[PDB]
Amino acid sequence: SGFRKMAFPSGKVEGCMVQVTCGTTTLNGLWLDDVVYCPRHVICTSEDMLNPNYEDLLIRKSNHNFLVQAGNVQLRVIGHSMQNCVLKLKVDTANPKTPKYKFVRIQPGQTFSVLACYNGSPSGVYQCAMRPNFTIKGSFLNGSCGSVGFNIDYDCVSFCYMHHMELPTGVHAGTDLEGNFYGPFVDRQTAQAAGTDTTITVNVLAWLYAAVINGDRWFLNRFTTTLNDFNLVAMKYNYEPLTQDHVDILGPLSAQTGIAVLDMCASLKELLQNGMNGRTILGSALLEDEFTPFDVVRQCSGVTF
Amino acid sequence: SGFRKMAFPSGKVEGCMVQVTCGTTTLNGLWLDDVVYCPRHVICTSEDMLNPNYEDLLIRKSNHNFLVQAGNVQLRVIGHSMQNCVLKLKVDTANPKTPKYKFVRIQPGQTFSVLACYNGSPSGVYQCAMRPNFTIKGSFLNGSCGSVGFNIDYDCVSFCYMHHMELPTGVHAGTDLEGNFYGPFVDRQTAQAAGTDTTITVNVLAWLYAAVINGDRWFLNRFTTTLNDFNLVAMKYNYEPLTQDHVDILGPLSAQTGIAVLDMCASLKELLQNGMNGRTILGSALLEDEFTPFDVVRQCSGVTF
Numbered sequence: 001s002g003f004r005k006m007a008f009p010s011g012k013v014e015g016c017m018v019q020v021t022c023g024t025t026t027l028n029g030l031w032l033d034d035v036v037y038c039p040r041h042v043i044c045t046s047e048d049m050l051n052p053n054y055e056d057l058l059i060r061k062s063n064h065n066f067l068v069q070a071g072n073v074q075l076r077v078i079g080h081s082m083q084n085c086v087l088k089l090k091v092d093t094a095n096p097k098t099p100k101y102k103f104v105r106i107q108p109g110q111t112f113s114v115l116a117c118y119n120g121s122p123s124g125v126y127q128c129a130m131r132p133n134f135t136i137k138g139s140f141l142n143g144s145c146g147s148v149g150f151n152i153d154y155d156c157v158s159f160c161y162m163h164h165m166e167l168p169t170g171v172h173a174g175t176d177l178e179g180n181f182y183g184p185f186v187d188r189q190t191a192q193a194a195g196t197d198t199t200i201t202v203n204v205l206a207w208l209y210a211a212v213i214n215g216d217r218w219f220l221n222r223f224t225t226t227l228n229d230f231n232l233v234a235m236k237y238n239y240e241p242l243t244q245d246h247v248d249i250l251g252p253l254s255a256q257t258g259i260a261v262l263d264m265c266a267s268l269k270e271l272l273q274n275g276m277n278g279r280t281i282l283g284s285a286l287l288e289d290e291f292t293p294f295d296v297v298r299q300c301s302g303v304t305f
Numbered sequence: 306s307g308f309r310k311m312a313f314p315s316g317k318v319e320g321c322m323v324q325v326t327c328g329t330t331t332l333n334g335l336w337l338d339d340v341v342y343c344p345r346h347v348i349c350t351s352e353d354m355l356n357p358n359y360e361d362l363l364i365r366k367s368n369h370n371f372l373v374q375a376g377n378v379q380l381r382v383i384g385h386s387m388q389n390c391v392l393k394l395k396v397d398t399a400n401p402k403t404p405k406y407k408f409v410r411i412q413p414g415q416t417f418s419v420l421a422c423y424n425g426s427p428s429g430v431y432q433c434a435m436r437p438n439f440t441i442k443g444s445f446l447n448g449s450c451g452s453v454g455f456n457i458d459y460d461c462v463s464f465c466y467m468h469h470m471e472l473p474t475g476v477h478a479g480t481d482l483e484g485n486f487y488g489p490f491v492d493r494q495t496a497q498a499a500g501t502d503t504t505i506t507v508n509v510l511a512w513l514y515a516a517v518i519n520g521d522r523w524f525l526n527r528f529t530t531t532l533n534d535f536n537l538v539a540m541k542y543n544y545e546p547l548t549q550d551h552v553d554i555l556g557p558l559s560a561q562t563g564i565a566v567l568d569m570c571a572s573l574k575e576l577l578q579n580g581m582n583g584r585t586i587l588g589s590a591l592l593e594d595e596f597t598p599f600d601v602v603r604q605c606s607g608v609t610f
C-alpha cells in the first residue's frame with residue numbers, strides 16, 4: 001500500500017556522470033563506453049548564445065580544449081564530434097561502470113527519473129514527465145546542464161533526456177541523447193516561450209485507477225461517457241485529448257479494477273466539474289498527471305483492495 | 306528554478322542491497338562490511354508472527370539456514386545474532402562496495418530517502434518524512450521488508466530506517482539500524498494502529514520559503530505574530546508546535562527572502578483559517594510538510610554527493 005512519486009534507483013547513472021569544461025564554462029557529461037555526451041552549448045560564451053554558429057565555434061576547438069573530469073581523474077579527449085545539439089567527446093578510457101543502456105526518444109506524457117548534477121557530481125533524483133508542450137517541470141539551477149533523464153526497466157538504462165536550458169517561466173527544455181530537442185526549442189538565448197500546457201489525461205486516468213487499486217472509490221459515479229463527449233468536456237479544462245490508443249493502454253488497469261475506461265472517464269468529468277470537496281485522492285488535493293499507466297502497474301499491487 | 310520532491314542519489318545504498326531467505330520467507334538485507342542487517346521477522350512463519358519468541362526461534366537456526374544472495378553470488382553466513390528487532394548475519398566476505406556510513410536515529414519531521422527493494426534488487430527511490438506519529442507514508446508491497454531509509458551528509462550515508470511492516474491504514478512502520486522501532490509498534494501480527502497524525506509545522510514553513518524563493522508570493526501578508534499566538538492557532542489545526550529551535554533553524558531562509566519566521570507564521574495562520582482560495586503553492590493545493598529547512602536550502606543551492 002501507499003503511492004509515491006518514485007524515481008528509478010540512480011546508481012547506474014551516477015557512475016556515468018562526469019564534469020566537462022571548455023574554457024570558463026563547466027557543465028555535466030554522460031560517460032558511456034569511450035564517449036562523453038554533453039550539451040554543445042558548453043563551447044559558447046554568454047555572448048555566443050544569441051546566434052551561435054556551433055559548426056564555426058567547434059571547428060576552432062581541439063581535443064585538449066575539452067577538460068573531462070571523472071571523480072578525481074582527468075580523462076583524455078581523443079576526438080570530438082557534434083550530433084545535432086549534443087557534443088560527443090571521444091575519450092581514451094571506456095567507463096568501467098557503463099551499464100547496459102539504450103537511447104530512447106520519449107513522447108509527451110512519458111515519465112522519467114532525473115539525476116540532477118552539478119560539476120559532474122549527483123545532487124538529487126526526482127521523477128518528471130515530458131509535458132504536452134515538450135517542457136519538463138524540473139528543479140535545476142545554473143550548472144545543471146548535461147544532467148540526464150532516464151528509465152531503468154530490467155537492468156537496462158534507457159536515457160531519454162539531457163538537460164540544456166531553462167525557459168523564462170522556470171520550466172526546462174532539453175534533448176534526447178541524439179541531440180534532438182524535445183519541442184520547438186533551440187539552444188539559443190533568443191526569445192522562446194513554452195506553449196500553453198495541458199494536463200496529461202491518460203496519466204490522470206491511470207492515477208485514478210491507482211487510487212481504486214489502493215482502496216479508494218469515493219470519486220466513482222454510476223455514469224459512462226462516449227470518448228467524443230469526454231474529449232469535448234476535457235478540452236474545456238485544458239486536458240489533452242484522450243485517444244483510442246490511450247483507451248487501449250488503460251485496458252489492463254480497467255480489467256484489474258473492473259471499471260471500464262469510459263466509466264473512469266465519467267468519474268474524471270465529474271471531478272473536473274465538482275472539484276474534490278475537501279477530499280483527497282492518494283494524498284493529493286489536485287489530479288496528478290505524472291504517473292503513466294505503466295508506472296501505475298509497476299508500483300501498485302496486482303490485487304485490488 | 307523549480308522545486309521537486311527530491312531523494313538523495315541511491316547508488317551508495319544500491320551496492321549494499323542483498324536478498325535474505327530463511328525457509329519460505331524472502332526479504333531484503335543491508336550488507337555493510339561483513340554483516341548483513343535485516344528484520345528479525347525473517348525467521349518467522351505466519352503462525353510464529355502471531356506471538357513470536359525470537360530468541361527461541363533463532364536458537365533453532367544455524368548459519369546455513371540463512372541464504373544470502375548478493376546479485377548472482379551466494380554469500381556464506383558464518384554467524385548470527387539479534388540486536389533489538391534487527392537480525393545481524395555475519396558473512397565471510399566484506400562488501401567491497403561498503404560506503405562511508407553511520408547508523409543514525411532520526412526525529413519525527415526529519416526526511417530521508419527510501420530505496421524500495423524486492424528480492425535484494427532496488428526498484429525505486431522516493432523521499433519521505435518520519436511523521437509525528439512515527440509512521441512513514443511509504444509505497445511498499447509484500448517483499449519490501451528490509452528496504453532502507455537514508456540521508457547523505459558529504460560522502461557518508463547515514464542509514465536511519467529499515468522497513469518492517471505495514472499498518473492497516475496503509476502506512477508503514479520500521480526501525481533504526483540498531484533495531485529500535487520508531488513509534489509504539491511491535492514486530493508481531495497483532496492489532497496495531499497509527500495514532501492521530503499532525504502536520505510538521507517547521508517543514509511547511511520551509512516549503513513556504515521555497516515557494517517564495519521560486520517566485521510564488523501571493524500568500525505573503527503585512528502581518529506578524531508572536532510564537533505563542535501562532536502555537537495556539539497551530540494546535541487548533543493539528544499542527545505540531547513550533548519551537549524557538551524551529552525559528553532559529555529557519556533563520557537563513559528568513560534572511561534570504563526577507564520574510565521573518567513569525568511574518569511567515571502569520572501567512573501560515575491565514576492559510577489555515579482561510580484555505581488557498583482556489584490557488585496553489587508550488588503546484589500544490591495542500592500545504593506540503595515533507596521538506597525540512599535543510600532540504601529547501603540544499604535544493605535551492607545545489608549541494609552534491
Ligand SMILES: O=C(Cc1cccc(F)c1)Nc1cncc2ccccc12
Pocket residue numbers: 041049140141142143144145164165166167186187188189306
Ligand atoms: O538555460 C541555461 C543556459 C542556456 C541559455 C540559453 C540557451 C541554452 F541552450 C542554454 N542554463 C540553465 C539551465 N537550467 C537551469 C538554470 C537555472 C538558472 C540559470 C540557468 C539555468
Ligand SMILES: O=C(Cc1cccc(F)c1)Nc1cncc2ccccc12
Pocket residue numbers: 001346354445446447448449450469470471472491492493494495
Ligand atoms: O507487514 C508486513 C509483515 C509483518 C506482519 C506483522 C508484523 C510485522 F512486523 C511484519 N509486511 C509488509 C510490509 N510492507 C508492506 C506490505 C504490504 C502487503 C503485505 C505485507 C507488507
Ligand SMILES: [Cl-]
Pocket residue numbers: 105106107110
Ligand atoms: Cl514514450
